[PDB]
């Protein structure tokens, strides 16, 4: 009945585009209805707020309500149910009547989908009647009003697709708040850190750059996480007092020490948050978008990738580059989104560079292991693909890595069945929806490009093809040095091993097998070495040049026909 | 659950064989139960009606119910299923109990296949339990009914094979409502047009001949379409009366004119439906099921020798099935047309199909070959599966030498499996026509008598025949006739077949469009258009 | 047996076996038992498994709660014995297969069916039996 | 159509086809019939499967319970012709495709829509019709 005059517009930031639409669609036909009365125009606009969960929908609808000043009727869907089938409609009939009786008025149906789901699956009689009562109540607004003191019903929900189409048709105005951009997140961070003590090194613009895919709720956790880091020094001092009072692992003792006193509360000095604590806070906070379905960042760096300079240049100029400098690349017409289909013989490093790109781009990473999205139920197999891109867009920039993609988009022959074709078509449409300025970088890897659909390789789709093939003799030297370096002979002996004619067809995996064979040959030599020198555990196994000599003899290339993989 | 005395026996026709069985299997153990009572034997008969959809299954069960007069309980299978799993059996247990409580009674389980499906593949618990509930409710009828009165269960379904064998066994009487024949469709058409005013030219036998593959529902649309055409004259007269009363587009005014009077009613003269409107109505109505070709003998030029052979082995034994059957002339399963390609083998097969008024299916060669072990033979069997259902039907296998090669030692196991399937189906009102240009490669078991043992050679025209064909082609699309003689007698058409002459006419037509285009930059088909058409058309 | 709510369906089975124990000696006839005793392995659900588990519990109480003086026999009939759950099928000590009748059986069946009727002395049931090969 | 009971919804429908027949001739308008008469292949809801049966049965009673010349015509309008049951769309022989309005028609719509509003004098309801060739 009264506005909630405790949250203001200043407390909600980053919604500048959303607040612009809400000015001419909610505020105006609630306070300046006289102009509409002079104009003679009924306002039947049902304003619907939708977007990712945590974007500040509930808070905004309460901040707007407190600012407009007109009578406000907050409605919570679970609180509508009282304990009787007929009483549920009584609560709804007591809202649309009260708003009409107290027009102009604002109705907020928070979590509308909790009582406005799909009626097709609504088997229960009570559930299907609440939707009918709600939808009829909107027509009464258009009828029982002077066409001047309009009543606007505002509904907020994080699942706009769950609304009954009988209801969503009645909500003409739909406001997609979406996720805030880099400029918007800076505004939120400044707004959030307004009652706190801060240092001078805090660059909120820098903080916004390295928090992609965060929403207003997620940015609140980053501030909250940084506050805890600011109090870390005030806990160690509290721990030290407990240690000095008392003459099991260390963390357990800390709980036991603080459990002891529980009454001798000591003053926490009022320190301020530095910039180093904010960087620590961002790492500790996982955004709500990255909670589910996002793979862990691989441990592979460019130091783990030997040679492949041509592939590295293409990857550092099409994916890693645009992620680091989205403005430098967009000046030369390089859009911050790409689709790359890595292909080549097996064992040559297609997955290795994709794991290095995911790790060297510092961006979000989603990995799909072949036909991981297929499900035995109807529609759920296709919904997984659509939901896959529903989070890749929300967490842009994001890297989608389809490993062994020939199993997910096979050639649409007669022997395909009406289950994977429905997924290939869905995957084709989603790749079309990936905008040039969307921020999704799709990487595909397959070792049999002759079995992958040719429709996936068109522009807009995975139209960029990078060939990863067998290394040359000079190329294997970089790879063999890279492999030996990452496991610890020096580097001059590695050139002799890699340039040997017995490694003519070796791929990247074969060179790794060569090193493992030499390592096993060392241990066999060590086992006999420690039996002649002993009959004390001080034996030193070291990979010697003679171990490489017998490793070259017993290792053959895993690739049979190198030219079999150059045909597509 | 009272019997509706709405649809009568007169309103259901063409079921004379069906109505004879239903008299001693439904009427007797519902009205004359006393005779069973004296003998002391309950008569429990579950009558099952099945056939193509639209054959008049639902209507028959309601016409019988209204004539018997006993209590009737219409049951629709989808409405039995309720929101709760246990409520579906509740609906069924409230039916078989009600019939027992209200014996004698008639139960109509319309669309039984919607719930009495095969519980084997119906692995879901509710699906497999409806069938069990149905079967137990029928046993209680045999057990708990009195000796005096019987309860008859009538089931209708268009897919009798989908029924659970535990259920189809409970329906002893099965009536397969096939599709009506020419004699039967005439009875249906007369029954539908019984309360209407008709003219004298209406030949119901002619209507039945030119409506093959139609069912009772389709024939109701044909009657409904002809009735609307019959009222077209009654609307123009109605519009003129409104115009004469009142001195915005025209259709809007017509609505406004008729809104004026309303309560003021003027007489509609009682006109009658002619036969020409019935012929128009049939064309406008597309049956749910192929279609008689539009090619007549006026589209076929010359080929009189081929026509006589075709008019004596196929076309004749269709128009007068009794005149030919009087002298012992069985309708040969078909004709094996052969000759060079492009000479009118498919054209004449479409002409035979049109002067026979039967359905036509055309195969353009090896369309039936499949890489699988069974689908290649199933395509041939499905070809004859529809041909029987739409009898009379003409099956035309064009370039049949790729579908039935000679079963020599070098044949493998893919074409032999197709020849055998085709041989058995030809043994099983279907007129199969085959065409091939290499008769030395077709199996000799096909060309035996009873199978396609009649061979008619359709070959290249010499010179006079092309004149008739070119005149025929030009006549059906609208140069005069003196220029057509010059075109057909030109030495450049030495090897032209029927298709080449058709290609020649299209080339001349295209040459006309080039002339119109240049005329409008600075239409009658002229001789100069034929001049450049002769150059750009080859016999191939 | 099947009811609407959760425990209604399983409580109907428990009432059947408890009533038989209270009425011992008694004969339970579970007609079309394959409808409710289907293989919960392939038929994966929540109610279906609890129906099967209630019959297994029920069929064990009858052979343990009866006072050694009166016995309870459970008779079940089904066209699909393979659709029964093995935990329930194994609980029937006797399986009796009633196949299609032979020529000798068909003659006896006709006489029983043609017992309350009036027949002519010309009727030869041997001819009727021999002309109905695959009749049940 | 929706009632306070699952069976009451058909009562409301059965009170419509009966009223039109009782007050024949009459006009029944099933606006967006497909919204409650969709395909019931995946619609296992009990109410959904009974509306289609009720709709088809109500049309037969029209053909039966009328004084011949007191017909009752049921007119149905829907923007989703694909949701109709093929068992029902076959029973509707006459289909009227309204289509999209032309340039002359769109001018009337624009004038009709801007009828309760305060407008200036420069508004030429002709330029708007020219630049809306795909608007409905």
């Amino acid at each position: 009945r009264t506005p909630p005059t405790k949250v203001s517009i200043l407390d909600i930031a980053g919604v500048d585009d959303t607040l612009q639409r809400l000015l001419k669609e909610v505020w105006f036909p609630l306070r300046g209805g006289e102009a509409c009365e002079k104009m003679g125009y009924r306002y039947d606009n049902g304003v619907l707020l939708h977007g990712p969960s945590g974007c500040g929908k509930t808070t905004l609808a309460h901040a707007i309500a407190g600012s407009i000043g007109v009578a406000f009727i907050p409605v919570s869907a679970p609180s509508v149910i009282g304990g009787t089938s007929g009483e549920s409609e009584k609560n709804i009939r007591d809202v649309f009547d009260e708003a009409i009786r107290l027009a102009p008025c604002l109705i907020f149906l928070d979590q509308i989908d909790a009582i406005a789901g799909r009626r097709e699956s609504a088997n229960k009689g009570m559930e299907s009647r609440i939707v009918a009562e709600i939808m009829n109540g909107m027509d009464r607004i258009r009828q029982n009003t002077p066409l001047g003191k309009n009543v606007v019903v505002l509904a907020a929900t994080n699942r706009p697709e769950f609304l009954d189409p009988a209801i969503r048709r009645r909500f003409s105005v739909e406001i997609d708040m979406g996720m805030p951009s880099e400029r918007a997140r800076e505004q939120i961070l400044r707004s959030l850190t307004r009652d706190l003590s801060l240092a001078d090194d805090i660059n909120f613009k820098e903080l916004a750059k390295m928090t992609p895919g965060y929403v207003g709720s997620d940015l609140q956790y980053v501030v909250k996480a940084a506050v805890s880091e600011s109090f870390q020094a005030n806990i160690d001092s509290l721990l030290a007092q407990a240690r000095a009072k008392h003459p099991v692992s260390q963390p357990q003792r800390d709980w036991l020490l603080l459990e002891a006193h529980r009454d001798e509360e000591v003053s926490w000095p009022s320190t301020k948050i530095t910039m180093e604590q904010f960087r620590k806070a961002v790492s500790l906070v996982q955004p709500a978008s990255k909670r589910e379905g996002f793979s862990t960042i691989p441990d592979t760096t460019w130091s783990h990738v030997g040679a492949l300079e041509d592939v590295r240049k293409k990857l550092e100029m099409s994916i890693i580059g645009p992620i680091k400098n989205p403005e430098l690349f967009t000046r030369v017409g390089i859009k911050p989104a790409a689709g790359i289909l890595l292909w080549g013989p097996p064992g040559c490093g297609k997955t290795l560079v994709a794991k290095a790109v995911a790790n060297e781009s510092k961006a979000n990473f989603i990995s799909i292991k072949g036909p991981e999205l297929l499900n035995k139920y109807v529609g759920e197999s296709e919904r997984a693909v659509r939901q896959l891109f529903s989070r890749a867009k929300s967490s842009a920039p994001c890297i989608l890595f389809f490993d062994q993609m020939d199993a997910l988009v096979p050639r649409r022959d007669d022997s395909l069945s009406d289950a994977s074709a429905r997924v290939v078509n869905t995957l084709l449409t989603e790749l079309d929806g990936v905008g040039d300025r969307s921020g999704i970088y799709v990487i595909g890897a397959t070792n049999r490009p002759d079995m992958i659909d040719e429709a996936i390789r068109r522009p807009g789709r995975l139209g960029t093809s990078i060939y990863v093939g067998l290394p040359s003799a000079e190329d294997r030297v970089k790879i063999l040095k890279t492999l030996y370096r990452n496991t610890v002979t020096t580097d001059a002996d590695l050139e002799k091993v890699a340039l040997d004619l017995r490694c003519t067809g070796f791929s990247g995996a074969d060179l790794g097998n060569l090193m493992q064979a030499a390592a096993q040959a060392c241990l066999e030599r060590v086992y006999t070495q420690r039996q002649q020198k002993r009959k004390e555990e001080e034996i030193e196994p070291v990979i010697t040049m003679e171990d490489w000599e017998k490793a070259l003899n017993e290792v053959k290339p895993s690739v049979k026909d190198p030219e079999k993989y150059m045909h597509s | 659950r009272t019997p509706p005395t709405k649809v009568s026996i007169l309103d259901i026709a063409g079921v004379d064989d069906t109505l004879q069985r239903l008299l001693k299997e439904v009427w007797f153990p519902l009205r004359g139960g006393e005779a069973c009572e004296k003998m002391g034997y309950r008569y429990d008969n579950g009558v099952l009606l099945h056939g193509p959809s639209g054959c008049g299954k639902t209507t028959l069960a309601h016409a019988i119910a209204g004539s018997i007069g006993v209590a009737f309980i219409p049951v629709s299978a989808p409405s039995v299923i309720g929101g709760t799993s246990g409520e579906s059996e509740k609906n069924i247990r409230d039916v078989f109990d009600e019939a027992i409580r209200l014996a004698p009674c008639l139960i109509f389980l319309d669309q039984i296949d919607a719930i009495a499906g095969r519980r084997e593949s119906a692995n879901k618990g509710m699906e497999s339990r409806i069938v069990a509930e149905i079967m137990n409710g029928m046993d209680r009828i045999r057990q708990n009914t009195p000796l005096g009165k019987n309860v008859v269960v009538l089931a209708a379904t268009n897919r009798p094979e989908f029924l659970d064998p535990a259920i189809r066994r409970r329906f002893s009487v099965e009536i397969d409502m096939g599709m009506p024949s020419e004699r039967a469709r005439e009875q249906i058409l007369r029954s539908l047009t019984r309360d209407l005013s008709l003219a004298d030219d209406i030949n119901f036998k002619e209507l039945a001949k030119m409506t093959p593959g139609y069912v009772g529902s389709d024939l109701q649309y044909v009657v409904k379409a002809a009735v609307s055409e019959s009222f077209q004259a009654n609307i123009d007269s109605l519009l003129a009366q409104a115009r004469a009363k009142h001195p915005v587009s025209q259709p809007q005014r017509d609505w406004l004119l008729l809104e004026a009077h309303r309560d003021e009613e003027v007489s509609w003269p009682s006109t009658k439906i002619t036969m020409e409107q019935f012929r128009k109505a049939v064309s406008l109505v597309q049956p749910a099921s192929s279609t008689i070709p539009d090619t007549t003998w006026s589209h076929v030029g010359a080929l009189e020798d081929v026509r006589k052979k075709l008019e004596m082995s196929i076309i004749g034994p269709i128009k007068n099935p009794e005149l030919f059957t009087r002298v012992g002339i069985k309708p040969a399963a078909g004709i094996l047309l052969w000759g060079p390609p492009g000479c009118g083998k498919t054209l004449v097969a479409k002409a035979v199909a049109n002067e026979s008024k039967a359905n036509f299916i055309s195969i353009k060669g090896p369309e039936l070959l499949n890489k699988y072990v069974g689908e290649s033979e199933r395509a041939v069997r499905q070809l004859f599966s529809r041909a029987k259902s739409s009898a009379p039907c003409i099956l035309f296998f064009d370039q049949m030498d790729a579908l039935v090669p000679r079963r020599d030692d070098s044949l493998s196991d893919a074409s032999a499996r197709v020849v055998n399937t085709l041989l058995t189906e030809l043994d099983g009102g279907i007129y199969v026509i085959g065409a091939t240009n290499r008769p030395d490669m077709i199996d000799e078991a096909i060309r035996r008598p009873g199978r396609l043992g009649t061979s008619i050679y359709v070959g290249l025209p010499s010179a006079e025949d092309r004149v008739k064909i070119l005149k025929t082609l030009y006549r059906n699309t609208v140069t005069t006739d003196a220029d057509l003689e010059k075109v057909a007698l030109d030495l450049r058409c030495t090897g032209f077949s029927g298709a080449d002459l058709g290609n020649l006419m299209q080339a001349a037509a295209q040459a006309c469009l080039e002339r119109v285009y240049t005329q409008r930059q600075q239409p009658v088909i002229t001789m100069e258009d034929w001049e450049k058409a002769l150059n750009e058309v080859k016999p191939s | 047996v099947i009811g609407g709510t959760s425990g209604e369906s399983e409580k109907n089975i428990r009432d059947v076996f408890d009533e038989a124990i209270r009425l011992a000696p008694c004969l339970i006839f579970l007609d079309q038992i394959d409808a409710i005793a289907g293989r919960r392995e392939s038929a994966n659900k929540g109610m279906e498994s609890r129906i099967v588990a209630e019959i297994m519990n029920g069929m064990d109480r009858i052979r343990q709660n009866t006072p050694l003086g009166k016995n309870v026999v459970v008779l079940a009939a089904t066209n699909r014995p393979e659709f029964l759950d093995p935990a329930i099928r194994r609980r029937f000590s006797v399986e009796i297969d009633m196949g299609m009748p032979s020529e000798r059986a068909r003659e006896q069946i006709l006489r029983s069916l043609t017992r309350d009727l009036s027949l002519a002395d010309d009727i030869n049931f041997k001819e009727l039996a021999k002309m109905t090969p695959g009749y049940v | 159509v929706i009632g306070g009971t699952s069976g009451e919804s058909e009562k409301n429908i059965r009170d419509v086809f009966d009223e039109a027949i009782r007050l024949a001739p009459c006009l029944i308008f099933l606006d967006q019939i497909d919204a409650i008469a969709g395909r019931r292949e995946s619609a296992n809801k009990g109410m959904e499967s009974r509306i289609v049966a009720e709709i088809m049965n109500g049309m037969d009673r029209i053909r039966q319970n009328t004084p011949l010349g007191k017909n009752v015509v049921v007119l149905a309008a829907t923007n989703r012709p694909e949701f109709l049951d093929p068992a029902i769309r076959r029973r509707f022989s006459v289909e009227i495709d309204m289509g999209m309005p032309s340039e002359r028609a769109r001018e009337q719509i624009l004038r009709s829509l801007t009828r309760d509003l305060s407008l200036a004098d420069d508004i030429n309801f002709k330029e708007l019709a020219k630049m809306t060739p795909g608007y409905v």
Partner: peptide, 23 residues
């Protein structure tokens, strides 16, 4: 008024098949 727990129908699934080739 007391809301009771009511069981409902089950979802449908997909099944793969194997097809022979005469070639």
């Amino acid at each position: 008024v007391v809301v009771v727990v009511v069981v409902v129908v089950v979802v449908v699934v997909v099944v793969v098949v194997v097809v022979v080739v005469v070639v």
